[PDB]
Design a binder for this molecule. Structure first.
Ligand SMILES: [K+]
Ligand SMILES: [K+]
Ligand SMILES: [Zn+2]
Lengths: 51, 393
């Protein structure tokens, strides 16, 4: 169990083991969402200044 | 002489179209009474925004009118009053302690930076609207920076410092025999009524709330003195009046005035302290109920001059003014507000709506029957003699 646990620990501290890859496709969504909101803000603001 | 009915969908009639001249001055929003005061000119600016972003500017003509001059102000006010207004600033008030005491200045009507300029803008817009109406250019003339109807010929009263409606009607009277003035604020339109009380050429008609209220005047038995007797109509009302009630009271009074007085230039004050949710008024009117008045006064077909007034919750005045202005152009707008620079202030669902509450209506079929019968009685001594050829008003 030492072999297995430290193999997973130093195979994970790079970023490849399952647990850290189940929280990374759950936070990239949050960042993508915030960025989409920023873009929509600017889109509405500029098309307001235009008119 | 009053039967209560349901409130019918407001709807523009296609047989008449107008030429709206809208007056706005990008400076006006920039003045502020003080820290906590309920009067905020900024709301006029807010309404402008919606007019731009709804696409409503494309059927009317938007003008800045030149500010009114000192000697155009002294057509109604005194020289001492106007000279005080012109010389007093928030910095030298200590050297006017007599005049401030003497002209009703200091708590309900303070002095801010830009007082005289704000007054100039209001008066200018009103007089230029009247003049353009005299020259046969426009049919309706809108000026939301004017309507400060509580000001006295020698006194500041009730957030108002200059009576621009008096100047407007004076300019309208150069070419017209008979001018009607309608006042649907929640307070009594007392400056205009005190100004035109002993004449028969201006008929004032107020729909206000009489009680332990402001200003304290305008009873059912105050109907004019001298040759102006029966030429001042008051409709006192109680709390809670809503759209159906208000419409059934408002329509027949106005229609009988139009049939008897036969005026042929209407001024319309469209104050907004008579809406549900206002912070000083106490009525329970919707946006459709407050706009059906405008629609009815417009369905007659004589030169109208629409002005502003009260409204102390900015959101609701802005929305109802934009909706009314859309209605003057034969356009029923859409309920979803377009994105604009004030896409706050419109919580929680961002729509073109003013919502009523459930508070109770203290006005019942007998009080109103009595009031309207007294009025219909007072309102038959105001016709024109049989030999007097008119111009089909
Ligand atoms: K009124
Ligand atoms: K009068
Ligand atoms: Zn008022």
């Amino acid at each position: 169990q030492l072999v297995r646990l430290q193999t997973e620990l130093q195979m994970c501290l790079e970023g490849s083991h399952p647990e850290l890859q189940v929280y990374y496709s759950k936070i990239a969504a949050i960042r993508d969402y915030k960025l989409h909101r920023a873009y929509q803000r600017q889109k509405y603001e500029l098309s307001c200044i235009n008119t | 002489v009053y039967e209560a009915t349901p409130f019918d969908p407001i709807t523009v009639k296609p047989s008449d179209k107008r030429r709206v001249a809208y007056f706005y001055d990008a400076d006006v929003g920039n003045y502020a009474y003080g820290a906590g005061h309920p009067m905020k000119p900024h709301r006029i600016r807010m309404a402008h925004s919606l007019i731009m972003n709804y696409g409503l500017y494309k059927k009317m003509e938007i003008y800045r009118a030149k500010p009114a001059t000192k000697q155009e102000m002294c057509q109604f006010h005194t020289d001492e009053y106007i000279d005080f207004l012109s010389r007093v600033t928030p910095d030298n008030l200590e050297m006017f302690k007599r005049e401030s005491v003497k002209f009703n200045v200091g708590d309900d009507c303070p002095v801010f930076d830009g007082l005289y300029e704000y007054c100039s803008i209001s008066g200018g817009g009103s007089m230029e609207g009247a003049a353009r109406l005299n020259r046969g250019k426009c049919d309706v003339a809108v000026n939301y920076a004017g309507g400060l109807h509580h000001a006295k010929k020698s006194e500041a009263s009730g957030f108002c410092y200059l009576n621009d409606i008096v100047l407007g009607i004076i300019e309208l009277l150069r070419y017209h025999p008979r001018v009607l003035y309608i006042d649907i604020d929640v307070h009594h339109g007392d400056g205009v009524e005190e100004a035109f009380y002993t004449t028969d050429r201006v008929m004032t008609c107020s729909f206000h709330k009489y009680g332990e209220f402001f200003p304290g005047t305008g009873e059912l038995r105050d109907i004019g003195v001298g040759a102006g007797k029966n030429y001042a109509v008051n409709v006192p009302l109680r709390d809670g009046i809503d759209d159906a009630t208000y419409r059934s009271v408002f329509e027949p009074v106005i229609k009988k005035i139009m049939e008897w007085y036969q005026p042929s230039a209407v001024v319309l004050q469209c104050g907004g302290d008579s809406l549900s949710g206002d912070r000083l008024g106490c009525f329970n009117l919707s946006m459709e109920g407050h706009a059906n008045c405008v629609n009815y006064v417009k369905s007659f077909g004589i030169p109208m001059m629409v002005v502003g007034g009260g409204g102390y919750t900015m959101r609701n005045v802005a929305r109802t003014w934009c909706f009314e202005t859309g209605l003057l152009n034969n356009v029923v707008l859409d309920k979803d507000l377009p994105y604009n620079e004030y896409y706050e202030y419109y919580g929680p669902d961002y729509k073109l709506s003013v919502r009523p509450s459930n508070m109770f209506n203290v006005n019942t079929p007998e009080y109103l029957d009595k009031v309207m019968t007294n009025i219909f009685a007072n309102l038959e001594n105001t016709k024109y003699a049989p030999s007097v050829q008119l111009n089909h008003t």
